[PDB]
Amino acid sequence: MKILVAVKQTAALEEDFEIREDGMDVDEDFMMYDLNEWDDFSLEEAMKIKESSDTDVEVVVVSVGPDRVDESLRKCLAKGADRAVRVWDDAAEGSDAIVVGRILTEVIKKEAPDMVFAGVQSSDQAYASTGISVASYLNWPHAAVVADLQYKPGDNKAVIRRELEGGMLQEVEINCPAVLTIQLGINKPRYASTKPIEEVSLADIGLSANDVGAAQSMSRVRRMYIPEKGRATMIEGTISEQAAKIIQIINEFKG
Amino acid sequence: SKILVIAEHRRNDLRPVSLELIGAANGLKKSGEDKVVVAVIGSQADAFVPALSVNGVDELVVVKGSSIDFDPDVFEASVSALIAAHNPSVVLLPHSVDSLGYASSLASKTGYGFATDVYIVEYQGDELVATRGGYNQKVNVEVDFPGKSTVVLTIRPSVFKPLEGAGSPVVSNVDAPSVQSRSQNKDYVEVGGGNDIDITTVDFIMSIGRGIGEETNVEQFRELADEAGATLCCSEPIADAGWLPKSRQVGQSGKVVGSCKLYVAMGISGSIQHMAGMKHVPTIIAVNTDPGASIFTIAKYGIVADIFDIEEELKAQLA
Numbered sequence: 001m002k003i004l005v006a007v008k009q010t011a012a013l014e015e016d017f018e019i020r021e022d023g024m025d026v027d028e029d030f031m032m033y034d035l036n037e038w039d040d041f042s043l044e045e046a047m048k049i050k051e052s053s054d055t056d057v058e059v060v061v062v063s064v065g066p067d068r069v070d071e072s073l074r075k076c077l078a079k080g081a082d083r084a085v086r087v088w089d090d091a092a093e094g095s096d097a098i099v100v101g102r103i104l105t106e107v108i109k110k111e112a113p114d115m116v117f118a119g120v121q122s123s124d125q126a127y128a129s130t131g132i133s134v135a136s137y138l139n140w141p142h143a144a145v146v147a148d149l150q151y152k153p154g155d156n157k158a159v160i161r162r163e164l165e166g167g168m169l170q171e172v173e174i175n176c177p178a179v180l181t182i183q184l185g186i187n188k189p190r191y192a193s194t195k196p197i198e199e200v201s202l203a204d205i206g207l208s209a210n211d212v213g214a215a216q217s218m219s220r221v222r223r224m225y226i227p228e229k230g231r232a233t234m235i236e237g238t239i240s241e242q243a244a245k246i247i248q249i250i251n252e253f254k255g
Numbered sequence: 256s257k258i259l260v261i262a263e264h265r266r267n268d269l270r271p272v273s274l275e276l277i278g279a280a281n282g283l284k285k286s287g288e289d290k291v292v293v294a295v296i297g298s299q300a301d302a303f304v305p306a307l308s309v310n311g312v313d314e315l316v317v318v319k320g321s322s323i324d325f326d327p328d329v330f331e332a333s334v335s336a337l338i339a340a341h342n343p344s345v346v347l348l349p350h351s352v353d354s355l356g357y358a359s360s361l362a363s364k365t366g367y368g369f370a371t372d373v374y375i376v377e378y379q380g381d382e383l384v385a386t387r388g389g390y391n392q393k394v395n396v397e398v399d400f401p402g403k404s405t406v407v408l409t410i411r412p413s414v415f416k417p418l419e420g421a422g423s424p425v426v427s428n429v430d431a432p433s434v435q436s437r438s439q440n441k442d443y444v445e446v447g448g449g450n451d452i453d454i455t456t457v458d459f460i461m462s463i464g465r466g467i468g469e470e471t472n473v474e475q476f477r478e479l480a481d482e483a484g485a486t487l488c489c490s491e492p493i494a495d496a497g498w499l500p501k502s503r504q505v506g507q508s509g510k511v512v513g514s515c516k517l518y519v520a521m522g523i524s525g526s527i528q529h530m531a532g533m534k535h536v537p538t539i540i541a542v543n544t545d546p547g548a549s550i551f552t553i554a555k556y557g558i559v560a561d562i563f564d565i566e567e568e569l570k571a572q573l574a
């Protein structure tokens with residue numbers, strides 16, 4: 001019994017970041033990298049399933065990305081993931097959600113897991129696409145935005161709740177194996193912020209430069225730019241006068 | 256050419272994002288002669304033809320599949336057959352929880368252009384140019400779809416304006432392709448937790464986010480809210496943690512605060528999903544120590560200061 005968890009190391013930007021000379025991305029010098037927030041919850045859900053079971057449950061984390069990503073995979077192993085896999089070649093640079101879905105599927109084919117978990121979306125690009133693209137290439141049952149999972153290892157069905165707009169959920173019975181995208185709040189991850197990572201090349205999974213990268217993506221980036229955004233009226237001063245302005249605004253509202 | 260719009264309904268009600276997409280489709284088409292085709296999918300979807308017989312709809316296709324409401328196998332199959340039948344240049348879906356269940360699967364099988372959560376779209380000549388966000392909404396990413404005769408976009412809700420008035424589409428009925436779904440929908444559910452206030456009805460909200468830190472810090476904001484005559488609401492992490500009831504959560508998964516005139520957002524970054532619940536509020540005050548927080552891009556007033564220091568001074572001045 002095996003659960004495969006696809007994880008992304010996302011980038012967040014420091015203040016005063018700049019667009020790189022070619023205009024296709026932000027300068028990497030302004031990026032801070034960490035595990036995608038949604039992956040904390042999906043990894044925790046796999047671990048909860050592992051701990052609730054007397055049957056062995058292998059939890060395998062997999063990420064497509066350059067060598068910086070090993071730091072995040074190492075942290076997953078430290079939380080009790082059994083194995084971690086990084087897939088990369090430089091040709092994979094610029095791969096969108098659909099191409100990454102394809103690459104992930106080639107690993108999943110070899111791992112032959114009983115369930116695949118992915119996050120609802122990434123905190124950086126927020127495509128909300130990668131996990132369900134994997135489901136297409138696998139041709140597996142799937143559901144997106146899973147906030148509850150009733151599943152025991154080896155069951156051929158599970159019952160999920162998907163989190164809908166406007167304060168409601170929908171219970172859905174889904175055939176297993178399945179791909180699920182996992183929403184924030186499904187559990188309370190316990191670790192709130194020597195076994196090597198397995199390194200896999202495109203060649204290892206039967207792919208070449210022609211299968212991946214920007215040229216095989218389903219849209220082309222023309223440019224990335226810092227837009228003009230709306231601007232607040234910043235209240236400067238001491239805490240006391242900032243509070244005084246808020247009260248005046250409150251009073252204006254009340255009268 | 257044709258632009259195909261996939262409408263959305265749930266629990267017998269048409270979701271208003273449907274009409275936004277029709278607005279988007281009509282604004283996008285290059286020529287008077289181009290047609291907007293709207294599809295509504297469900298076993299009881301004929302009920303929605305009056306509500307979709309509106310300005311800017313040239314053709315309305317009622318697709319009867321096996322499920323009442325959204326099912327990802329049913330939808331992917333149906334939309335794939337709609338694309339085949341109508342050969343649209345552009346297909347518009349809502350960036351909704353339903354679409355998340357199938358949009359990218361649809362795009363993986365075929366050579367279709369694809370981008371999600373799009374909030375600017377136009378033709379430059381015959382070239383479709385779409386804009387979405389990058390790096391937690393800190394940039395715009397502008398994309399095109401070279402050589403793609405069909406492009407599927409999911410469209411950010413509450414960006415594109417609906418048209419006004421009725422329409423007279425050519426209405427047609429089709430059966431969805433006959434393939435058995437690998438899931439079955441069961442009950443809709445609203446989860447437990449206190450529900451003493453309907454936050455869609457209140458006019459003055461103080462809302463707390465992850466910036467409050469530990470659960471022990473909730474009480475001081477409850478006290479502030481009470482002293483001010485505001486209703487205490489929150490962002491998702493507070494409610495997910497069980498620190499305030501889900502009924503107080505503002506945003507996509509929570510509630511839209513339609514009656515709110517004054518919203519004080521304390522320790523909330525302003526994610527897109529939080530904004531969905533409160534960006535319409537006429538006077539928004541944000542209190543946040545990160546000047547780069549998205550919330551300041553919609554706030555009327557901003558205070559780059561510690562929320563605990565602000566809360567305590569506010570309380571003292573109010574007394």
Ligand SMILES: Cc1cc2nc3c(=O)[nH]c(=O)nc-3n(C[C@H](O)[C@H](O)[C@H](O)COP(=O)(O)OP(=O)(O)OC[C@H]3O[C@@H](n4cnc5c(N)ncnc54)[C@H](O)[C@@H]3O)c2cc1C
Nearest residue numbers: 464465466490491506507508509522524526528544545562
């Ligand atoms: C399908 C889906 C539905 C969703 N629905 C909702 C929804 O209904 N509602 C919702 O809120 N989110 C929703 N989200 C979740 C959303 O993506 C974000 O995770 C969430 O909005 C972030 O909440 P936050 O702003 O409180 O936390 P954060 O983004 O972590 O922001 C915390 C903020 O506090 C500030 N801060 C920290 N310390 C202090 C201090 N001492 N003084 C002042 N400021 C401080 C920080 O600068 C930061 O900006 C949804 C997401 C998905 C994918």
Ligand SMILES: Nc1ncnc2c1ncn2[C@@H]1O[C@H](COP(=O)(O)O)[C@@H](O)[C@H]1O
Nearest residue numbers: 006007064118119121122127128129130
């Ligand atoms: N490079 C990647 N490697 C592994 N999983 C990924 C990668 N990119 C996205 N994902 C998965 O998709 C989720 C993010 O969704 P998206 O916004 O579609 O990228 C993550 O939580 C992962 O489960």
